[PDB]
Structures are given as structure tokens and as C-alpha cells.
Amino acid sequence: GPSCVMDDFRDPQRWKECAKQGKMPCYFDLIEENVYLTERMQCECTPLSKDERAQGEIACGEDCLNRLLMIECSSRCPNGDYCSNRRFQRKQHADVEVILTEKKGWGLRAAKDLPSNTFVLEYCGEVLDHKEFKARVKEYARNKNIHYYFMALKNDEIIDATQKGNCSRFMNHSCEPNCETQKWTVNGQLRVGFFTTKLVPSGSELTFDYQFQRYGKEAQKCFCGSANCRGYLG
Numbered sequence: 001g002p003s004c005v006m007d008d009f010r011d012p013q014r015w016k017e018c019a020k021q022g023k024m025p026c027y028f029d030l031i032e033e034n035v036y037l038t039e040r041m042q043c044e045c046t047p048l049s050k051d052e053r054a055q056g057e058i059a060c061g062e063d064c065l066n067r068l069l070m071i072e073c074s075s076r077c078p079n080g081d082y083c084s085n086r087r088f089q090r091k092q093h094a095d096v097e098v099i100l101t102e103k104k105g106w107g108l109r110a111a112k113d114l115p116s117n118t119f120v121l122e123y124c125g126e127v128l129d130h131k132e133f134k135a136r137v138k139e140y141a142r143n144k145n146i147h148y149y150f151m152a153l154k155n156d157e158i159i160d161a162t163q164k165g166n167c168s169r170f171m172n173h174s175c176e177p178n179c180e181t182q183k184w185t186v187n188g189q190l191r192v193g194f195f196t197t198k199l200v201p202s203g204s205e206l207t208f209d210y211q212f213q214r215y216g217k218e219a220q221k222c223f224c225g226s227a228n229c230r231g232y233l234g
């Protein structure tokens with residue numbers, strides 16, 4: 001159908017008028033970082049030379065101890081600004097577009113080829129404690145037309161993407177997905193991101209397996225079209 005770049009989502013008034021025309025998804029409150037509703041490690045990498053970086057060597061690449069432990073480097077990194085392990089902080093998300101699919105509503109696609117383990121986008125939302133989550137579950141169990149999406153960070157920290165979020169709201173489900181969520185520590189805070197699990201060619205829909213989040217006592221029929229399709233997302 002039609003397509004949308006992430007900048008289109010940054011003008012609320014132009015967005016609302018495109019959604020009435022069916023040219024953009026339904027309006028929602030866009031946030032580019034988690035909002036908390038209640039007030040709540042150097043790597044052993046050798047800093048790379050000018051000659052090393054030019055010859056193709058990766059600063060805080062696959063061998064970074066921080067990276068292997070899913071910890072981003074701080075501003076105190078030996079590799080400084082050339083450090084490739086500060087993706088959440090530097091907002092180094094993938095080139096992605098929002099597209100209308102045939103059967104699954106709006107979806108996310110790769111606008112460039114994305115190698116395996118590429119940061120796609122952060123899973124953003126309102127972060128809830130115990131009590132707020134309990135009140136929200138109760139409020140949702142009345143509305144019934146509400147499709148609730150939760151991602152636990154830790155026990156007293158649950159991401160709610162149902163009302164506020166970013167374009168990771170458009171990530172559809174697949175039974176044979178090409179993305180996964182990963183939970184990272186970023187300057188002491190737990191953050192979750194979508195990361196590709198294979199090379200995703202340009203134009204390919206970006207998908208994840210919904211079983212790794214908390215969502216709907218309801219069970220939607222599945223149009224992922226995978227050979228291994230389980231028939232439902234419930």
C-alpha cells in the first residue's frame with residue numbers, strides 16, 4: 001500500500017490527517033525514550049589505531065566483554081567516539097519504514113540490507129511498577145477492544161507499549177521471525193531493543209516472535225505465512 005519514514009511520525013497534525021486518509025497508521029503518542037510513571041565497567045578492548053580502523057577492524061566489536069554481556073560502553077571507553085557498542089545512547093537504529101501489509105495492518109520493513117545482529121529500534125513505552133501494572137491489567141480487562149503489549153525489564157519495571165511507544169509498535173508477529181528482543185544495560189538502566197537474527201534484505205518485513213513478550217488473553221489468527229506457522233498468536 002503506502003509507506004512512511006520515521007520523520008512522518010514527528011508531525012502530529014500532518015500524521016492525524018494522513019491516518020484519516022488511510023495513508024498513515026492510526027495516531028498514538030510517540031516517545032523516543034522510555035517514560036517512567038514513578039520516580040524510582042570498562043571493557044578490556046585495545047583502543048584501535050587509525051591504520052586498524054581503516055583496515056576494517058571493529059572498535060568494541062564481537063569480542064568486547066561489555067558487548068558479550070549486553071552492556072553498552074560509557075563515554076569513558078578506550079575506543080572513545082569510534083566505539084560501535086553505544087547504539088542505544090547514540091540512537092543508531094536501522095533504516096526502517098512503515099508499510100501497509102495485505103492482512104496484518106501496518107508493518108515495519110528494512111529500507112536497507114540489515115546484517116545479522118543489527119540494532120533495529122528500541123522497544124519504547126511507559127515503564128510501570130508492580131502497582132501501576134496491576135491497575136493497568138485491571139483497566140485493560142474492561143476496555144476489551146484494547147490490545148495490550150508488555151515487556152518485563154525486571155520485577156518492579158514493566159514496559160507498557162499499549163498507549164505510548166515508537167515505531168516498534170508496527171513490528172508484526174512471525175512464527176519464523178527475523179528479529180528478537182535483547183535486554184541491554186545502558187548507563188545502569190535496563191533497555192530492550194529489537195535485533196535482527198539473520199541478514200534481512202532491503203524491502204523485507206521485520207518480524208518477531210510475540211511469545212517473548214506479555215500480551216492478550218485473546219489469540220489472533222496468524223497470517224505470518226511461515227512453513228512452520230503455529231496458526232495463532234495468543
Ligand SMILES: CCCCC[NH2+][C@@H](CC[C@H]([NH3+])C(=O)O)C[C@H]1O[C@@H](n2cnc3c(N)ncnc32)[C@H](O)[C@@H]1O
Nearest residue numbers: 104105106149161168169170172173221222223224
Ligand atoms: C511492541 C511490539 C508489539 C506491539 C504490537 N504490534 C501490533 C502490530 C501493529 C499492527 N499491525 C498495526 O497495524 O498497527 C500487534 C497487532 O498486529 C496484528 N498482527 C501482528 N502480527 C500478526 C500476524 N502474524 N497475523 C495476524 N495479525 C498480526 C494483530 O492485530 C496484533 O494484535
Ligand SMILES: [Zn+2]
Nearest residue numbers: 043045060064
Ligand atoms: Zn570493548
Ligand SMILES: [Zn+2]
Nearest residue numbers: 060073077083
Ligand atoms: Zn566500547
Ligand SMILES: [Zn+2]
Nearest residue numbers: 175222224229
Ligand atoms: Zn504464523
